[model samples]
Target: MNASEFRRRGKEMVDYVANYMEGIEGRQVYPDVEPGYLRPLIPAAAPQEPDTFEDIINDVEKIIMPGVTHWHSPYFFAYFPTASSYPAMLADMLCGAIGCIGFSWAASPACTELETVMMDWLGKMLELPKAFLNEKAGEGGGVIQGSASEATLVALLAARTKVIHRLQAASPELTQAAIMEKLVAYSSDQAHSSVERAGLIGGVKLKAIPSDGNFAMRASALQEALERDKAAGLIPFFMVATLGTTTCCSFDNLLEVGPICNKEDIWLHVDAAYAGSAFICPEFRHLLNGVEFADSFNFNPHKWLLVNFDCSAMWVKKRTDLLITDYQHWQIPLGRRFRSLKMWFVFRMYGVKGLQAYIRKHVQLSHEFESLVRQDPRFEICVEVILGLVCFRLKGSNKVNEALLQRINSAKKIHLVPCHLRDKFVLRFAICSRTVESAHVQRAWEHIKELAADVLRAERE
Candidate 1:
């Protein structure tokens, strides 16, 4: 397309996006299509000749949107919030236009510098220690990882390298292969699956410490595991403390685990993928208290801080542990997008105070949902409601809860996903969309209550 065509299409695209967001609530929260639904709708091969932009845009509604799970819809109470905002969207367009592959500072000096400063800005907002701030010019600093999963893997790899160097320095005869074979890492049993996957990819054994009644990994459980692993000749090199877990949003006792890791000289990596955004609010900042003791910390602004996806903020106490003149050494991918542009735009558009209010609103909605659950004796809250996620289930068997969830999804009024907390099946209601409100929550509950009644009656029969 020429400049004139491009101008017209860009304006049209922007309007199309705005219209979609405005009308999103009216659309179904979840799609009705099943597996392989899209295959027969379009041609098997790509078009040989050029197709008009009008045809492509028309096909978006015909072939694309039908199978979409409207994650930005007000009724989408799914896994976790993947943030979306007007400012971030605008920044993303600018980033696409520039299209620089920022593998090194020289490649795109502004891209690299902006990312470093933006990460520091976010670190300060979270009240991270000055050691993690680039402005201090200390050995510590922050980086923008694509996701929390990547951040975890990077931390694990860095810890592995540090330990290998330390061991080799003291015992020159020790081989890297031997040290790796004896290495073990730890995380709460309630931690995200990605934590375990990090260990797998790092080529080390990952142990899950049993959590307490609150579903938190406490000092005792962790210490017990450390003792047993050491007795078995395993070298505990690293541990990941979760600020907010995936299954139930349970917080691992970081205060209790941090000191233990310090005394044992084990590297502690904190993964707060979802709830980290709440730290901007003073009341919720206490949840991140033990972060000071960690060697590395990570959280996804894309998940909750109103930036779009592929923007995870990670900080390290010792930058040399993951060195780089080129950005390649910092992450799995060599070429990086200018994702910090989104952070810069969102942070400016919604100042710290505004961001805090956004987090507070979502949290309040979760508590309101929790209260609704309490009023109905037929249901039980599976865990403490903290932040924007509520885990609840029927008072009876897991089978009934599962059936209820099946009915809820089948109805398609709202979208929710289920997780197994220990042996019990629990439904996860996460305050996802930026536009979700009290009325949507109330309507979702009423819908759930209606379907639950059907499930219970059928169970009786």
Candidate 2:
């Protein structure tokens, strides 16, 4: 397309996006299409002739729109929310236009420096310890990772490298393979699946300490495991503490776990993929106690804050001895997009007050949902409503709860997913979409109750 066409078509695209967001609630939360649904609808191979942009946009509705699960729908309450905002979209357009592959400080100075400044801005907003901020000669700083999973892996590898060097200095005779065989990591049993995957990818043994009834990983459990591992000839080097776990959004007792890790010189990495955004609010900041003991911390602005996907803010207490031109050593990828542009735009557009208000709104909605569950005798709250996520289940057997969940998904008025908290199967209601409100919560609960009643009636019959 020519520059003139590009200019005109871009405005049309903006209108299309605005319309989708404004009317998102009217769409189905989840798509009803089966696997391979798109294959039959489109041409089997690429067309030899060039298709006009108008024709491509036409195909978007006829072919693409129906297959998409409307993640921005108010009724979407399955996983955590992916950020959606006008400011973020606008910045993303600029980023794509610039198209710089910023792998290091020298690659694209604006891209790298902006990212560093943006991370510091976010760190201050979260009230992170001063050591995590970046300046001209600071030993500690932050970086933008593609996802929390990547952040976790980066932390693990850094810890691995640090420990290996320390051990080699003391035991010069020990080979890298021998040291790796004894290397160990720790996380709560309730931690995200990605934590285990990180250990696997890092080539270390990761032990899962059993969480307490409240689903928090306690100091006592970690200490006992550390001692047991030390006695068994295993070296524990890292711990990934979840600020808001995936299943129930349960926070590990960082206050208790932090000191133990410190005493043992273990690297503590905090994974707050969903809950960290709430830390900007004073009321929720207390839940992040003991974060000062962490060597690295991460949270997904994409999941909770206004920045879109592929922007996870990770801060480290130390630079891990990486050269300036080799920033790629800090992460798995060599190409870093201009993700900070979206963050900078979102932060400036919303300001701190507006962002805090957004978080509080979701928390309030979660509390409202919790109260409804409490009022219904047939259901029980399985976990504390700490943030935007609420975990609950029906008062009967797991089978009945499973049946009810299946019925709700099949009907598709709203969307939710099941989680196993301890041995009990539960439903997770994360205030997922930015557009979600009290009405959406109420409607979802009413839909759930209706399906539950049907399940009970069928069982009785």
Candidate 3:
């Protein structure tokens, strides 16, 4: 495309994005499309002919839109939130237009430097402990990971490497597998499945400790598990303290949990993918009570901080602390894109006050929803209402909850996901996505209650 065509297309593309987001809520949150629907619509082989931009966009609704679970749709309350604001979208456009890979300081000087500055800015924005800041005139800094899953695995790898280095210092002759087999990691049963996956990827044993009645991971349980593993002659090295777990947004008590890590000499990596954004408001600071104890802390600005996907911000106390895991070092990728360009845009666009406004608003909406669920005696909240996420179910067996989830996902009026705590099937409602307001939350609850009532009536039959 020529420069004029590019400009014209870009402007039209912005309008297209706006229209899609604005009207997405009105459409089905989850599209109803059958498998192999695209086999005939799209060609199996690449077409030699070039397609017009109009044709491409038209095909989106005809083919692409039908098969997607609209993550941006306000009605989408599945898994953890992956939200993007307009400013963020614009940043993506600018980045795509410029399209630079961010590997090292020399490749894209602005990209590397800006990312470092913003990570510090964002860390300070979240009021993180100075130890995790990369720009305190010393080492602690941040890196933009593609996702929370990557961040978790990265942390696990580093912990694994660090422990090996420490152990090797004393026992230089130990075999790699011998050391690896002894390596163990811990997260609460309340943590996300990602924690377990990270452990698996790292080739380490991960123990999911039991949670208290509130569903948050208690320090006592973790301590007990640590003792058991250590007694079994296993190496306990990493503890993933979840800020917002995917299952139900249940917190793994950081305040009580951090000291234990300090005592045990275990590396603490906090996964605050969903609730991390909440810390921007000073009132929610208590949730991150033991953040200072953490050697590494990660949260997805993509999940709740209004940046798009592929923009999860992970800040560590030391850059080298995580070097053991990263496939490429700060030197390897050499050329990096200005990812900070968009995050920088979004941060400045929604300054601390602006960002906090969104966080507080979502939390308030969840409370409003909790009240709605409480009014009905049959439905009990399965998890705590910390921040903007709520996990609850129709007061009945797992079958009923599971059935309700199936029906909700099938109806496509709104989308939701299920989590289980202590064998009780539960549904999670996260209110962090954009275009979602009070009315959307209310409508979601109403639809949920309607689905639950239908499932109950059918289950009785």
Model number with the top lDDT: 1
State the weakest 10-residue window (summed lDDT) of model 2. Answer: 320-329
Task: Please say which candidate is ahead in lDDT: 1 or 2.
Answer: 1
By TM-score, is 1 or 3 better? 1
Please, what are the lDDT tens digits per residue for candidate 2 over residues 233-328? 999999999999898888999889999999998999999989999999999999888899999999999999989887898999888632233358
Please tell me which predicted candidate would have the highest TM-score against the true structure: 1
Better of 1 and 2 by TM-score: 1
TM-score of each: 0.98, 0.98, 0.95
Residue 53 of model 2 has an lDDT of 79
Q: Rank order by lDDT, top first? A: 1, 2, 3
Candidate 3, residue 277: CA error in Å?
0.7
What lDDT does each candidate get? 0.92, 0.89, 0.81
**Clash totals in order:** 0, 0, 11
Residue 53 of model 1: what lDDT? 86
Model 1: per-residue lDDT, tens digit, 313-351? Answer: 999988878823456777998999888899999999999
**Which stretches of model 2 miss by more than 4 angstroms?**
321-326
